[PDB]
Structure 1
Amino acid sequence: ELVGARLIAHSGSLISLAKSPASTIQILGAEKALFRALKTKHDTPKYGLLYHASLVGQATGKNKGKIARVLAAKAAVSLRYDALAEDRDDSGDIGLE
């Protein structure tokens, strides 16, 4: 609940977060590290705001980037299920699977 709140606070509205793709969610925190590196032809950050997620903290080294891609791409899928729902059971079963 704390990492996901910082994504909503960064993006703004809930619907604008679902309209963001998987890469935008993954690099949602480090706009400073991304746009500096894009305009100088360097390497982009791989974590952003998602470093404080629990599953990213379980990985080590190179594995932290690999998890943060899969976690944010699943979070993009999870957020698109959330922001448009009419038959929501409020149990988060799609998030759990």
Structure 2
Amino acid sequence: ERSEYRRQLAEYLQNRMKAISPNMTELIGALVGARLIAHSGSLVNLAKNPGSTIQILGAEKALFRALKTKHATPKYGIIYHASLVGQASGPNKGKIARQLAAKIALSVRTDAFEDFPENADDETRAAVGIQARAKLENNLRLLEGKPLNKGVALGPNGI
């Protein structure tokens, strides 16, 4: 019974996130969006954050440890358990984390400050999220389809 209630709570969290912030829900999804809203406190409190802040929300202990001891800061925070940074591998993971955090900052500012005529469909209420997700998936597949370095193909002699 606890599992059934937790499943319907996850469905409710998804529906309420698509109600509140359709752009960010179209970008990363309802659970990671709810984690970001939770850490920042509110939607208009998340919207006042730069993209570099939204990149490393949640990784703050490692961040301030590294900043105070002149180590190297963490590359991402809560954003790591989104969908779109999990397809990459290698340094393209950190590059996609940067780009995704910037698009999340734009989408949260749009979902927290833009007005709508109240007869506005959800497909046009999540327009910035749709456009940013399509562009960001194109940039991800370019970063993954970057070819490897050419080499000299040697014969059996060494010639």
The two structures share one fold, judged by TM-score above 0.5: yes
**4+ residue runs over 3 A deviation:** 88-91
How far residue 13 of structure 1 moved from its aligned partner, in angstroms, is: 1.3
What do the CA deviations read for 1:8-60 (whole angstroms, capped 9, x no partner)?
00000110111000100000110111000000000000011111010100000
2:62 match: 33
CA RMSD, 1 decimal: 1.1
Gap regions ≥5 residues in structure 2: 1-29, 132-159
Match of 2:128 in 1: 94
Alpha-carbon distance in 1 for matches of 2:83, 2:67: 28
What does residue 70 of structure 1 align with?
99
Mind listing any 5+ residue stretches in structure 1 that lack a counterpart?
none
Aligned length: 97
TM-score by length of 1: 0.95
Residue 93 of structure 1 deviates from its aligned partner by 1.1
Match of 2:90 in 1: 61
Q: 1:18 aligns with which of 41, 47, 68?
A: 47
Match of 2:75 among 4, 23, 46: 46
Separation (CA, whole Å) in 2 of partners of 1:86 and 1:56:
30
Q: CA deviation at 1:85?
A: 2.2
Which residue is 2:35 aligned to? 6
> Distance in 2 between the 1:79 and 1:52 partners?
18
Could you say what secondary structure the match of 1:55 adopts?
Answer: coil
